[PDB]
């Protein structure tokens, strides 16, 4: 409802950063190490 909706998109990744660049740098290390057995990659909203 703002005339430039960049913060409201980038807060919830309508249009923000990619799914591997905003996270804390341990969690990208965690989610790729636990790739086969405990996959948590479907909870982080890769935007297009």
């Amino acid at each position: 409802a703002t005339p430039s909706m960049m913060p409201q998109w980038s807060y919830m990744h309508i249009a923000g950063q990619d799914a591997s660049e905003y996270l804390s740098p341990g969690l990208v290390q965690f989610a790729r190490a636990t790739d086969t057995y405990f996959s948590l990659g479907n909870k982080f909203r890769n935007p297009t």
Binding site: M5, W9, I14, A15
Partner: protein, 49 residues
């Protein structure tokens, strides 16, 4: 034969496309009420399908 749908005056900010189809009124369960009288037709309702 023709229905003019209109909605007013909004910021179409991050809008995706449309999708639209047609289904029977007889098979549309009204979700907004808990119990739904007149809903006779137990018939694989396309509103939920």
């Amino acid at each position: 034969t023709s229905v003019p749908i209109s909605i007013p005056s909004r910021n179409w900010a991050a809008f995706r496309g449309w999708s639209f189809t047609r289904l029977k009124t007889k098979e549309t369960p009204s979700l907004g009420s808990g119990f739904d009288p007149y809903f006779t037709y137990s018939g694989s309702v396309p509103y939920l399908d």
